[PDB]
Amino acid sequence: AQAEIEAERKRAREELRKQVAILAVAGAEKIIERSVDEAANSDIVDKLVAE
Amino acid sequence: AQAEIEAERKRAREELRKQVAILAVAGAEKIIERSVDEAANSDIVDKLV
Amino acid sequence: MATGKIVQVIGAVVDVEFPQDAVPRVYDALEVQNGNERLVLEVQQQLGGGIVRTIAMGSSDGLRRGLDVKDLEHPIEVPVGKATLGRIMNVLGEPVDMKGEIGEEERWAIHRAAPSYEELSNSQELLETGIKVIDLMAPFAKGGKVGLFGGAGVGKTVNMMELIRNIAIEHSGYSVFAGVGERTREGNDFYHEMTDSNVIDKVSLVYGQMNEPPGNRLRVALTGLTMAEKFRDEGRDVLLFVDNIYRYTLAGTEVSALLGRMPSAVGYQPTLAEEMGVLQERITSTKTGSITSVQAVYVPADDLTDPSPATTFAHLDATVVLSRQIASLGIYPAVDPLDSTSRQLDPLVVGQEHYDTARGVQSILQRYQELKDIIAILGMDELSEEDKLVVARARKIQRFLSQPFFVAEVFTGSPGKYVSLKDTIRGFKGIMEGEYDHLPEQAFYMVGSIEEAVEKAKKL
Amino acid sequence: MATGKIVQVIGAVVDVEFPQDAVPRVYDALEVQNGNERLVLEVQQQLGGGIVRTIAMGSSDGLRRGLDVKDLEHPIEVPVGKATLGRIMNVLGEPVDMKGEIGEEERWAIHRAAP
Amino acid sequence: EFITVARPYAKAAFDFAVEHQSVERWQDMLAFAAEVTKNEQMAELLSGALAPETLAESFIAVAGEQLDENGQNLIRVMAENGRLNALPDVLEQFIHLRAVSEATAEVDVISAAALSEQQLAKISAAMEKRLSRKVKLNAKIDKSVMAGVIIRAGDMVIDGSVRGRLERLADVL
Amino acid sequence: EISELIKQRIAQFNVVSEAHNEGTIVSVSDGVIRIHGLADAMQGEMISLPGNRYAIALNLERDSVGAVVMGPYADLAEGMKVKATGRILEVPVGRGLLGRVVNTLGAPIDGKGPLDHDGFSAVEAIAPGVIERQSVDQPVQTGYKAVDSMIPIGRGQRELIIGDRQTGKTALAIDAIINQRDSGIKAIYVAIGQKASTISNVVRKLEEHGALANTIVVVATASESAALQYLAPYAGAAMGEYFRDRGEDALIIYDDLSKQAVAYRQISLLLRRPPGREAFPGDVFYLHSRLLERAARVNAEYVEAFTKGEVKGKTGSLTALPIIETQAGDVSAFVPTNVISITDGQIFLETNLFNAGIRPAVNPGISVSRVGGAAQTKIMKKLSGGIRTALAQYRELAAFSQFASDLDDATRKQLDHGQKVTELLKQKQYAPMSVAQQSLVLFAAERGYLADVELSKIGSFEAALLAYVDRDHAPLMQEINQTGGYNDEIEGKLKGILDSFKATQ
Amino acid sequence: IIYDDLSKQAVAYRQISLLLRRPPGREAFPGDVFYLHSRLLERAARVNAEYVEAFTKGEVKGKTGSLTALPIIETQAGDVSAFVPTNVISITDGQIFLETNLFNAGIRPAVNPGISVSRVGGAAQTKIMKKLSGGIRTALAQYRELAAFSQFASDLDDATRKQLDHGQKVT
Amino acid sequence: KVKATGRILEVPVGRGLLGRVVNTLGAPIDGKGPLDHDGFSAVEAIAPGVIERQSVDQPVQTGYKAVDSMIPIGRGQRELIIGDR
Amino acid sequence: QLNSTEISELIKQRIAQFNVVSEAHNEGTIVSVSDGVIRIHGLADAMQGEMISLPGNRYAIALNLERDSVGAVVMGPYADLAEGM
Numbered sequence A: 001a002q003a004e005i006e007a008e009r010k011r012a013r014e015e016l017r018k019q020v021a022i023l024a025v026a027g028a029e030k031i032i033e034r035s036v037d038e039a040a041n042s043d044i045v046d047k048l049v050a051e
Numbered sequence B: 001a002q003a004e005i006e007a008e009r010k011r012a013r014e015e016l017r018k019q020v021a022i023l024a025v026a027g028a029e030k031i032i033e034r035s036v037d038e039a040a041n042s043d044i045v046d047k048l049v
Numbered sequence C: 001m002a003t004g005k006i007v008q009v010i011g012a013v014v015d016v017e018f019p020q021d022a023v024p025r026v027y028d029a030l031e032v033q034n035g036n037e038r039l040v041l042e043v044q045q046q047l048g049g050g051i052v053r054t055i056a057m058g059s060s061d062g063l064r065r066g067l068d069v070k071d072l073e074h075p076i077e078v079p080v081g082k083a084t085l086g087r088i089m090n091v092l093g094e095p096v097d098m099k100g101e102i103g104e105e106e107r108w109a110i111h112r113a114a115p116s117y118e119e120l121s122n123s124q125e126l127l128e129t130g131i132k133v134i135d136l137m138a139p140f141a142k143g144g145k146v147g148l149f150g151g152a153g154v155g156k157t158v159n160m161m162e163l164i165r166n167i168a169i170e171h172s173g174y175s176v177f178a179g180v181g182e183r184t185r186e187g188n189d190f191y192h193e194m195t196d197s198n199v200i201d202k203v204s205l206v207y208g209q210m211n212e213p214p215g216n217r218l219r220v221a222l223t224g225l226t227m228a229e230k231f232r233d234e235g236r237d238v239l240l241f242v243d244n245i246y247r248y249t250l251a252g253t254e255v256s257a258l259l260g261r262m263p264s265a266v267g268y269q270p271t272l273a274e275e276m277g278v279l280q281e282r283i284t285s286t287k288t289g290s291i292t293s294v295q296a297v298y299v300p301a302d303d304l305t306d307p308s309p310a311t312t313f314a315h316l317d318a319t320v321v322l323s324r325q326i327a328s329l330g331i332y333p334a335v336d337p338l339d340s341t342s343r344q345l346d347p348l349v350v351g352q353e354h355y356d357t358a359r360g361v362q363s364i365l366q367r368y369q370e371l372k373d374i375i376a377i378l379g380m381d382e383l384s385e386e387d388k389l390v391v392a393r394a395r396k397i398q399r400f401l402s403q404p405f406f407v408a409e410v411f412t413g414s415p416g417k418y419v420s421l422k423d424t425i426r427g428f429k430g431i432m433e434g435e436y437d438h439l440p441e442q443a444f445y446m447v448g449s450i451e452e453a454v455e456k457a458k459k460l
Numbered sequence D: 001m002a003t004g005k006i007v008q009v010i011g012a013v014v015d016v017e018f019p020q021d022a023v024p025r026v027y028d029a030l031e032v033q034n035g036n037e038r039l040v041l042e043v044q045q046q047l048g049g050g051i052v053r054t055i056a057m058g059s060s061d062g063l064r065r066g067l068d069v070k071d072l073e074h075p076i077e078v079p080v081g082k083a084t085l086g087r088i089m090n091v092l093g094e095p096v097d098m099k100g101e102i103g104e105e106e107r108w109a110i111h112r113a114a115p
Numbered sequence E: 001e002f003i004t005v006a007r008p009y010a011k012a013a014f015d016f017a018v019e020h021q022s023v024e025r026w027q028d029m030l031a032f033a034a035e036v037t038k039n040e041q042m043a044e045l046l047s048g049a050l051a052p053e054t055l056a057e058s059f060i061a062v063a064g065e066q067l068d069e070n071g072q073n074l075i076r077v078m079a080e081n082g083r084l085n086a087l088p089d090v091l092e093q094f095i096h097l098r099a100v101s102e103a104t105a106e107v108d109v110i111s112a113a114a115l116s117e118q119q120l121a122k123i124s125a126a127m128e129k130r131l132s133r134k135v136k137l138n139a140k141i142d143k144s145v146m147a148g149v150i151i152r153a154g155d156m157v158i159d160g161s162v163r164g165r166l167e168r169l170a171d172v173l
Numbered sequence F: 001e002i003s004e005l006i007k008q009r010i011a012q013f014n015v016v017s018e019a020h021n022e023g024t025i026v027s028v029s030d031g032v033i034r035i036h037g038l039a040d041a042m043q044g045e046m047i048s049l050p051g052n053r054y055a056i057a058l059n060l061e062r063d064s065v066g067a068v069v070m071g072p073y074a075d076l077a078e079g080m081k082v083k084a085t086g087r088i089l090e091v092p093v094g095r096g097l098l099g100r101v102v103n104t105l106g107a108p109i110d111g112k113g114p115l116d117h118d119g120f121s122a123v124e125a126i127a128p129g130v131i132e133r134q135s136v137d138q139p140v141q142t143g144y145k146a147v148d149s150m151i152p153i154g155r156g157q158r159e160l161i162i163g164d165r166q167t168g169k170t171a172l173a174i175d176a177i178i179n180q181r182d183s184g185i186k187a188i189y190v191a192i193g194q195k196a197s198t199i200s201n202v203v204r205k206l207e208e209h210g211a212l213a214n215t216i217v218v219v220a221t222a223s224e225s226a227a228l229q230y231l232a233p234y235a236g237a238a239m240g241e242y243f244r245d246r247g248e249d250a251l252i253i254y255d256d257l258s259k260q261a262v263a264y265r266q267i268s269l270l271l272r273r274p275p276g277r278e279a280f281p282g283d284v285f286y287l288h289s290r291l292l293e294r295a296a297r298v299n300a301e302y303v304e305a306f307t308k309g310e311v312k313g314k315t316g317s318l319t320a321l322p323i324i325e326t327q328a329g330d331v332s333a334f335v336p337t338n339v340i341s342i343t344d345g346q347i348f349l350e351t352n353l354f355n356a357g358i359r360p361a362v363n364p365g366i367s368v369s370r371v372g373g374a375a376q377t378k379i380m381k382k383l384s385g386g387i388r389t390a391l392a393q394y395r396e397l398a399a400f401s402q403f404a405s406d407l408d409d410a411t412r413k414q415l416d417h418g419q420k421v422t423e424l425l426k427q428k429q430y431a432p433m434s435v436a437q438q439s440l441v442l443f444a445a446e447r448g449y450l451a452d453v454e455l456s457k458i459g460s461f462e463a464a465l466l467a468y469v470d471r472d473h474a475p476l477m478q479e480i481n482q483t484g485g486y487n488d489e490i491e492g493k494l495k496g497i498l499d500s501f502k503a504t505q
Numbered sequence G: 001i002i003y004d005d006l007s008k009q010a011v012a013y014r015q016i017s018l019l020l021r022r023p024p025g026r027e028a029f030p031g032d033v034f035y036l037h038s039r040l041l042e043r044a045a046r047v048n049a050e051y052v053e054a055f056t057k058g059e060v061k062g063k064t065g066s067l068t069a070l071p072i073i074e075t076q077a078g079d080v081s082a083f084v085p086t087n088v089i090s091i092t093d094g095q096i097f098l099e100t101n102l103f104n105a106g107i108r109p110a111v112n113p114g115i116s117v118s119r120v121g122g123a124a125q126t127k128i129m130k131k132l133s134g135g136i137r138t139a140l141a142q143y144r145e146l147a148a149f150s151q152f153a154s155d156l157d158d159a160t161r162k163q164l165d166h167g168q169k170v171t
Numbered sequence H: 001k002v003k004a005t006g007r008i009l010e011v012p013v014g015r016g017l018l019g020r021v022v023n024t025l026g027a028p029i030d031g032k033g034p035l036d037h038d039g040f041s042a043v044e045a046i047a048p049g050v051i052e053r054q055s056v057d058q059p060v061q062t063g064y065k066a067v068d069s070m071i072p073i074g075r076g077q078r079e080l081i082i083g084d085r
Numbered sequence I: 001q002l003n004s005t006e007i008s009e010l011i012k013q014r015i016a017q018f019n020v021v022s023e024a025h026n027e028g029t030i031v032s033v034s035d036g037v038i039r040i041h042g043l044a045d046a047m048q049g050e051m052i053s054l055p056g057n058r059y060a061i062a063l064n065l066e067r068d069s070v071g072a073v074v075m076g077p078y079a080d081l082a083e084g085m
């Protein structure tokens, strides 16, 4: 019965942790959509075009 | 123990709502290397609640 | 707006071409005006550039090449909830009882995935039934699957009407009846029976009869599950009766080759086992709620080896094999005690006296079977005395398995009998222990408890 | 120089395409560098257009759709004579034992007419 | 799909155009044949069950501004096999075959906004070092990219979008 | 507590572009997708679909790839982009997944967090070569008196449990697994096309009656796609082939190789591959053949060269027990006859013995063991030779028993003893029996201590004898359970024990 | 209505289907042979007086119409497992089996009881016939069992003997 | 040239068919003159639904003792006659 | 859509010469070899049942005269034969 409760603990933690992950990355998407500039797009591309 | 882990999750949820404020601005500059705008922190609290 | 055009109509299968963007996904619904008739199509394959191949949920007659098709961006969705109780519906969840609109609060898609492995719930809460042979040989728990296997005319329907009487009336929970490929007369006779008995207010009925085009007979089983699964998710205990699992597979066979599939072993579709699995793994009792289900299974040609009955044997908790021999001999219900079994027939979960009685009964009847052809050729005089004894006790046991049913009264002109489980054990143990060795065989035939066997013996 | 390309792989059946001058005879053997190993194919049918259909004399896993195939002019040829005594070989006449190379003087093709 | 029946005729035409130094003319000839084959009346003539000889005359006559070697034969032989609906695929097959022999790649780049023409020239010379061909960039302005670029080089691709990295990180979580 | 680990996951990330081939889905039907593109696709590669689903590249046709979806397929659509990974199908392996329930991909369905596998192995691998393989001469005790006495199993052998439905095929296999709780033999149960509630009932029995710690459970339920069912057994073999190549013995049970054959038939027909005898594909032999010939005992040179000099004098093995269901006992059907040719001994479970209550319903004379008595331990070998002859003589003299009497007393004795040894070789389901317990019970039958007790009490007689032996002479049981040795001193001591027990109840 | 040979219809539909190049099924019959006979036979029915009144626009009131069907099938050497017999046996409300052995033995009409059933049964009889016929149905079925089981016993129990004679009388 | 008359196959129906031998298309073949039909009806129609049925309680008499005692037929039943040639 | 025995070098010859009769009707080329059955292209002056003379001293017997190919069976060892003979 202790091992069965430990399984429900891990599952409940994981579900919360995935919810907050999804919120965090949706906010990061909005930040990326708004906080940007052309010299920063070019700064990223200049890491890319090396390869 | 099932009611215990329920209320433990309820106590965690509010504290992770604070930590997830931090992570959005940290990771959204991590993903472009260059730092994000301090001004653009507007509309981040929408994520909060 | 409409967005596709019909490009082929071969029998029951219709092909629709769409723009190469926004092609309908698999299992979606589509709509076309077949003259004045609104016809639904279900998408089965995305094949080639922009084309989808589909099955008509209605008659294919009257369709022209070049008709406009409108794509509904969802599966076939059916009413679910209390509003479905007391109403007959078709595969599309449209009322066929002429009582008006269903009035549903919610509608659910008939294609959904099965419960996850960690959701399944264990049970051994044995149901009691009036039927002697079943409760002796194949008792079944609340939340389990029961299958009635037989060829044509062996008693599948009469048994299922008896089990509906015995189980459902004591059951306080809602029930679903799925009439997959049923005869229309039998569906009307059932509806009137429930309406007279006043139990129609706790049963929802979905009927897809033989006359309907293959898509209806194919998909009507899933509308039955979708209603039962709504009740299970509300947390209820539900009774689900399915009139033939076989004519779901057969409705798949008819259309399979026109869908381009290469044929399999006995002409069945290549996807027979997956088609059976995806349906039968939804019929389960989860932690939230329990579905209890009784299914009749047609056995083509009376061979239990045919792929279709052969696969479904591996899904069921109890399997009551009816046999044509025993029916032809006139013993009813025609249950074969040697072939039928349950996974609840364990000494741990039944009473250990029950288990010992069952093992005795089966051992005796098996010992009779091997003697049968020996007596037939070489004669009864060339048995020994202890075999002449066990052949007599075998005949007495094989009579005491017979029973009159309240729903099989119209056929035979006799009252119906309900035997309690305890009385059944007590009788068969008494017969095997020989406490009734002196009574004739007919003193056990068509009787209730063994106290009624001694009353009729006195009259004899 | 390897003169053909793989054009299909369906299970153990490999189809390869050659120039119209170079098409293998019916039981010829072909070799492919599958992964790091060498895979022998035996030709079975000459379909039209320079495609020949072949059975893989080994595992078919890992074959891409454009690998170069070398066309040997002989059939499968195996070591014969006294050197083979005491040795275990596979179909291709290669040691499945670990004793070493078979010191054969002669290699004969597995296909020929009866006496 | 007609790609498989296109392949023998497209290879026969491409193998033939280099024997006669007119690849460039053959390409526009086939682009012509692909545009006429889309016509709604011509498709009815194609579906109309004439015998191949008289159907061949009924197509060759309508497309007369073609060489004797080129038009009147390729269109007839594909017409006997009933392959003429393959013509839009015969075209693309032909083009690809050419780009193969000419050591070229029709590289595509995708971005949220225009590149600086220094970024783009660097991309060209670097893809020409990644590959072994003369590249020919063409850009697309897709706003879902948000930042960075996608480079697609036939069957091969190179994702540098922020959206792909955002959804990758969402799954690393 | 939580979100600093999510911060760490943000830290553990790759920001640069990488390059691969990319394909476009042309068609979707019945779990099969046709993919245009992927000039670099290879036979048996894993294609990554959107949604973190994989497909397996099976057909490579001239212009399209035919790939089978390993999961729910119905939301896939024409024009989706599919990326080529370069990987032939890998699964996790190790001791970290010892004790857990996984699917064919090795993802846990247990619900009890992620795995701590030590690494990965290819699902497809070639079997050990002719010279790398060693003779089977160590026992695997199944704990059933009838099997372990008549039909012995050795570490490396490939026995077949063939029977009809509802005859105890699963019961015998899982009892075999349960008896390994304390041997060093790790165990694997592969559930192919079983219904999930049956699997769950089995898994609960495995924990309750003993140890699920020593068993890996691989699950592919009847609701999952045919690709996952087909491959499942190969994934289980890759998990057992991990222990074999490390120097440790293991035992794998494959449940319904007939269901694997059905799944392969479905995949083959949907990929349009030419049909054979029962529509099964032409290479249906080469499916089970290459599966089961991975079950082997392997010499110390191989295991020392595989491990590169970590274990030095060990010999690993992987015993296999495939399960086959015949239909109305047809032994000439295509899949049964293939598997009967591939394996080396079968445990034939007849149905009318099971209906008779003689459970387990093994049928001697048709059930053989091609490895012989080199797999038995010595005491079980000495005490079992006569049992085979006594049952053979009972087969022929059973016909007489039906109707006749006043035969010669030689015959009468022989028949009676046959009927009571038959009565002796039956036992309850979840009771396994140690070698010492089996030994002495067989000795009691073979030396004649039952010959005066040839009545219905034999079940009570055995239970009383096992209790008495445990109560008074357990150091003998320890010595036999350790050694399996037999000699004159053991023979005399066994006589002394039986002589004393007859004086009691 | 009597359909003379639903078998020869099935044969005609098979010919049409194959000439049209539709994919063959078992024994080469197309799959919609079950749909052919099922859509045909479920048309035979009895309809309530509300349906009659609705159909005839009020002209006929108080009457239930009915259509009864008697399809006929030929089996080869008594093989019931064949495709078309299996379909029709699955669709219909009963069977009358006529047998070569009984016909040659002189039992004409050569009906075999215990292999033939009526699922409507007692409801479709007059009360007299209902009453008298219930005893006959069991008596002949068990008589054939006793007649098989006691071929060789020269003497018998008169309870059994009585039954045996009575069964020969009713036969 | 083939024209497409947009109408499904219909057959003469009525009381005047009693006593007439007719081919599948409704043409008399007995040679006793034309039919007297009460309009036409369509050959391919759908059957009455579950709600439109009524149960069977009226007999149709065969006249054969074996049939009418052991295997009774009622008005709405669908009895199969099966056997050899 | 199967390729009906027409292939790129042959097609290029028809592109170069729209009427095929420029080659003599007495000769042809082997276009496929499959387990004894051979498939010749050409031979417009061949009749069913002829003795087609292969390279070497072998014969093959014409069995099918199709629209564009002859199908024949080789009398003897077939394994030596290639395309283009």
Ligand SMILES: Nc1ncnc2c1ncn2[C@@H]1O[C@H](COP(=O)(O)OP(=O)(O)OP(=O)(O)O)[C@@H](O)[C@H]1O
Binding pocket: C314, C342, C343, C345, C346, F163, F164, F165, F166, F167, F168, F169, F170, F171, F172, F325, F359, F360, F427, F428, F429
């Ligand atoms: N030794 C035994 N004593 C009593 N009962 C047994 C014994 N062994 C098995 N049984 C019972 O036999 C039944 C069938 O066993 P099991 O499920 O293993 O058969 P099976 O061949 O696996 O059937 P299936 O093939 O359908 O899975 C079960 O109820 C089981 O409890």
Ligand SMILES: Nc1ncnc2c1ncn2[C@@H]1O[C@H](COP(=O)(O)OP(=O)(O)O)[C@@H](O)[C@H]1O
Binding pocket: C150, C151, C152, C153, C154, C155, C156, C157, C158, C159, C332, C333, C405, C408, C411, C412, G117, G118, G119, G120, G121
């Ligand atoms: N218990 C019974 N008592 C009397 N008659 C029965 C009984 N069971 C079956 N029958 C007879 O056999 C017929 C066929 O069985 P039924 O259940 O109606 O169809 P199926 O068995 O094909 O579902 C019944 O209609 C009835 O005539």
Ligand SMILES: [Mg+2]
Binding pocket: C156, C157
């Ligand atoms: Mg029924």
Ligand SMILES: [Mg+2]
Binding pocket: F165, F166, F167, F168, F169, F170, F171
């Ligand atoms: Mg089992």
